[PDB]
Structure 1
Amino acid sequence: VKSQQQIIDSFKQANQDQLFQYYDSLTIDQQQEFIDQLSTIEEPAKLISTVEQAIQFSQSRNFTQLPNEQTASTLDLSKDILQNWTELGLKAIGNGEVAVLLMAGGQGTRLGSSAPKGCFNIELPSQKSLFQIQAEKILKIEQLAQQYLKSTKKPIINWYIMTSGPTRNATESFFIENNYFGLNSHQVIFFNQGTLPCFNLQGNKILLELKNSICQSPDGNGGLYKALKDNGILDDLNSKGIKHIHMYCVDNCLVKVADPIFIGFAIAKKFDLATKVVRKRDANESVGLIVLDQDNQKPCVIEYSEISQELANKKDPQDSSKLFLRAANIVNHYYSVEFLNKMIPKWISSQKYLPFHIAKKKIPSLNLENGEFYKPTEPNGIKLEQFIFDVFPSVELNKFGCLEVDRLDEFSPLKNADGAKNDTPTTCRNHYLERSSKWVIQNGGVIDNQGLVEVDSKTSYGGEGLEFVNGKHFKNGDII
């Protein structure tokens, strides 16, 4: 711990004299709170140099399809192979070797909600929040594993939920008020994501939010790795004997939590890291793509921008009807705990694996002239973010896997408030109900009046066990 003077001197030496412009006019308590905040910034001099340089760089690659040996598709695999992977996955779950890391983010502000995003109700007939839907998915897969192994008690899948600092209390309160949706209170473990200072447009100065406080912001989903180390989560995976991790984002209302087929794929192929993708059908779709970087022969994720319209439109040589680069990233990963133990210390210590991504933003803060707070109408600074997928190139190519899945069954994200064309509570609700209805019709059920039904996870995790609906008629809104 450093004293008031040592803290002040370290920021002044790092050319941040503007942070103390009003320091002497503050009360002693205001000063002490400010020093405490500044003390939380790890190696500030190093941070500032990295940012300014990163901003300069932000103002000719060779990409191709991943090698066939590293890919697979649930749309192509035989039912027997899918069942074998499911069994490998249920076996791991049944032996307590599987845990889930959830990136829950912050408030559902963009959706028009002040509550944590996981609390959002897309208005299914059941009115269940995203958190409850995912909690029931976990309970059901624990049940399917128990049945497969014929165990006396159901196995436990620990669910580690990373919240932003501001939503930690409301998130934990929501779970407690609902008695953990039926899960054991000990298997839901909360931990907060870290933050980084916000900077001016050039990236050479940290911004003051108030006369005695700097602007800070969540450090991107790539901040997960450092949060796992610092909050003792990696320690806990080891103490609990966990071997396999399924990681995803709370906003996917269709997510197959702890999917045994995905875990089994990784076990069968002995992968250190794997990812799920869905087919990109329109060369115009705005989504990240998983590709092979031919220059370093490593797997990686590229944004729509980094590809030429030509390559984006290029068709596959072995099937002109499909796009050449069609592996759309749905932020759904597998990691082996052995790989995490080995790589986390490396990843969090260098820009090589987790480079800062820069975002120009309108940041409410002190006006650089008068020193009074204000809400800008044009970008006046930048926010930093690390991306979860930037660690992909560090994996050995033959230890990386990419599983293509069916979008209609596995991915429908909640991103925009109702009114937009895509990714709204309405599209999520309709995709969820259409998936449920499809499952029912596939099993011989019939839905009257052009309606839709909802399938409860306690009845079916992903379409199995619905043989009993054969010949039965359902009404719009029925829950099965």
Structure 2
Amino acid sequence: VKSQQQIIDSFKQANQDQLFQYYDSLTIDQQQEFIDQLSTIEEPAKLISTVEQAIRNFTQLPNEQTASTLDLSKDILQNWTELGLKAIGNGEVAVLLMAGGQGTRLGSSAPKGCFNIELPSQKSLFQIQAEKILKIEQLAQQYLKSTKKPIINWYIMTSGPTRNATESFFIENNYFGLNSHQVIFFNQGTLPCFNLQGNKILLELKNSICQSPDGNGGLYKALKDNGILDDLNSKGIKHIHMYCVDNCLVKVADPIFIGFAIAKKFDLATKVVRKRDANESVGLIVLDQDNQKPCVIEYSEISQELANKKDPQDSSKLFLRAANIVNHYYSVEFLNKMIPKWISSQKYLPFHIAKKKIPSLNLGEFYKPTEPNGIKLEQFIFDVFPSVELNKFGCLEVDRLDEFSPLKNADGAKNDTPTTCRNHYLERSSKWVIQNGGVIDNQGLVEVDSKTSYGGEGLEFVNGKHFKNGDII
């Protein structure tokens, strides 16, 4: 621990004198708290240098590293399903939920997982995913003929701001049927916010700097610091499924995805769907021709010309169309070996710059700006992809209508709203029912309860039966 004076000196030597503009006029407790806040920032001069640093030839992945659920035979998919249900039934599968984002585009005070897309069940994203988990645990247990149901640890990464309401939500709901010990919360770190030029850290208040979650890429360090990686080893976990909280269709702990990784012996794998259109705000999974490594090019950093390139083999398609749906597979053995490397260098987790309108101290009191006035920093979870060996990387293309419908925007937008989430969810439910001989009245849509079906299976009993709009099956 450094003394109050030492923390101050270090920030001054890093040229952050603006941070102490009003220091002397603060009470002693405000000064002590400010210093406490400042001391969590490891090596400021470096960080400010690293931020300075922050301020192309791609092609499609080789066929050898790709596979698609829309092409594989029922037997292969069934075999992967079994490989995954076995891993699950043996207590080898854990799930990592990234829920540290603020979801600004959604305009809501509560954490996004608490969001209710108004399905007939009124169930939140969090509840939907928890029943998804209970369900696959049962499917795994049936498959293995176990007496006891396997447990799938659900590690939920929250941010300082989303933590209390998230944990409280789960407690208030008795964990949605899950064992209280299998839902494990841990906070990711933050990074200071900077001025538009990126050389000065912004003051939120006379005695506090503006800070924000360090991006989903800050998960690796949170994993190590919060003893999560330690827990994986102690519980004998071998497989990890990491996903985004906003996907209302997400197949949590999808046995097919896990079987796919097991079958091929992949250290790392990821899911993609066909890009909606040139402008869809999705990263794209490609092969960097320069180093012959898999990687993702984010939607906010790809050139307009490249996002619109037509495919040389087919004019009607976009050349780069493997949209990233934030569904990753990691082997625990790969994480044990790589996490130490990934968090001790900007090489695999470079900062990403995002201009923002940041409510903060005016250069002299608070104020809500109406044009960008600073930058937030973010590390991206996929920046470690090129560190994997190509033949150890897998890319599974899946069906969007069954696996990806994100909640990104408040109602009113054309895409990725509570309304599109709801419709996609009900359409998938209705299709499963109908696909099983069920009959839904015209203009009717039903909801399938995960307790009844994880993803379409076990719906045979629905044959010949009729349904009305809004029924829950």
Q: TM-score range by the shorter chain?
A: over 0.9
Alpha-carbon distance change, 84 to 101 in structure 1, aligned in 2, over 3 angstroms: same
Distance 2:353 2:299 in 1: 17
User: Residue 436 of structure 1 contacts residue 455 of structure 1 at CA under 8 Å; is this kept in 2?
Assistant: yes
User: How far is 1:367 from its partner?
Assistant: 1.5
Q: Deviations over 1:151-198 (max 9, x none)?
A: 000000000001111221111111111110000000000011110111
User: How far is 1:309 from its partner?
Assistant: 5.8
User: How far is 1:324 from its partner?
Assistant: 3.0
Alpha-carbon distance change, 306 to 416 in structure 1, aligned in 2, over 3 angstroms: closer
User: How far is 1:203 from its partner?
Assistant: 1.2
2:300 corresponds to 1:305: yes
Alpha-carbon distance change, 3 to 294 in structure 1, aligned in 2, over 3 angstroms: same
User: How far is 1:111 from its partner?
Assistant: 2.7
2:89 corresponds to 1:94: yes
User: How far is 1:305 from its partner?
Assistant: 6.1
User: How far is 1:325 from its partner?
Assistant: 2.1
Alpha-carbon distance change, 314 to 384 in structure 1, aligned in 2, over 3 angstroms: closer
Alpha-carbon distance change, 343 to 62 in structure 1, aligned in 2, over 3 angstroms: same
Distance 2:57 2:424 in 1: 36
Q: Deviations over 1:274-298 (max 9, x none)?
A: 0000012534434211000111000
Distance 1:179 1:308 in 2: 47
SS of aligned partner of 2:181: helix
Q: Give the TM-score of the pair, scaled to structure 2.
A: 0.97
Q: Give the TM-score of the pair, scaled to structure 1.
A: 0.96
Distance 2:141 2:233 in 1: 23
User: How far is 1:307 from its partner?
Assistant: 5.2
Distance 1:413 1:119 in 2: 14
User: How far is 1:306 from its partner?
Assistant: 5.6
Q: CA RMSD in A?
A: 1.5
User: Residue 98 of structure 1 contacts residue 242 of structure 1 at CA under 8 Å; is this kept in 2?
Assistant: yes
User: Residue 108 of structure 1 contacts residue 115 of structure 1 at CA under 8 Å; is this kept in 2?
Assistant: no
User: How far is 1:320 from its partner?
Assistant: 5.4
Q: Deviations over 1:247-268 (max 9, x none)?
A: 0011000000000000000001
Alpha-carbon distance change, 209 to 310 in structure 1, aligned in 2, over 3 angstroms: closer
Decide which of 284, 287, 291 is 2:279's aligned counterpart. 284
SS of aligned partner of 1:305: coil
User: Residue 89 of structure 1 contacts residue 260 of structure 1 at CA under 8 Å; is this kept in 2?
Assistant: yes
Distance 2:304 2:125 in 1: 36
Q: Deviations over 1:135-163 (max 9, x none)?
A: 00000000000000000000000000011
User: Residue 14 of structure 1 contacts residue 45 of structure 1 at CA under 8 Å; is this kept in 2?
Assistant: yes
The 5 Å alignment of 1:264-283 reads: 264-280=259-275, 282-283=277-278
Distance 1:126 1:118 in 2: 15
User: How far is 1:13 from its partner?
Assistant: 1.1
SS of aligned partner of 2:259: helix
Alpha-carbon distance change, 309 to 53 in structure 1, aligned in 2, over 3 angstroms: closer
User: How far is 1:315 from its partner?
Assistant: 4.8
SS of aligned partner of 2:339: helix
Distance 1:215 1:314 in 2: 39
User: How far is 1:122 from its partner?
Assistant: 0.5
Alpha-carbon distance change, 29 to 282 in structure 1, aligned in 2, over 3 angstroms: closer
Gaps of at least 5 residues in structure 1 are 56-60
Q: Deviations over 1:199-246 (max 9, x none)?
A: 111111111111111111111111111110111100100111100000
| Identity score, percent | 100
Bigger Cα displacement from structure 2, 18-27 vs 259-268: 18-27
User: Residue 281 of structure 1 contacts residue 322 of structure 1 at CA under 8 Å; is this kept in 2?
Assistant: no
Bigger Cα displacement from structure 2, 164-173 vs 383-392: 164-173
Gaps of at least 5 residues in structure 2 are none
Name the counterpart of 1:58: none
Alpha-carbon distance change, 143 to 381 in structure 1, aligned in 2, over 3 angstroms: same
Name the counterpart of 1:84: 79
User: Residue 289 of structure 1 contacts residue 328 of structure 1 at CA under 8 Å; is this kept in 2?
Assistant: yes
Alpha-carbon distance change, 379 to 305 in structure 1, aligned in 2, over 3 angstroms: closer
User: How far is 1:384 from its partner?
Assistant: 0.5
Q: Deviations over 1:59-88 (max 9, x none)?
A: xx1111111110000000000000000000
Distance 1:426 1:380 in 2: 32
SS of aligned partner of 1:105: coil
Alpha-carbon distance change, 19 to 175 in structure 1, aligned in 2, over 3 angstroms: same
SS of aligned partner of 1:366: coil
User: Residue 356 of structure 1 contacts residue 384 of structure 1 at CA under 8 Å; is this kept in 2?
Assistant: yes
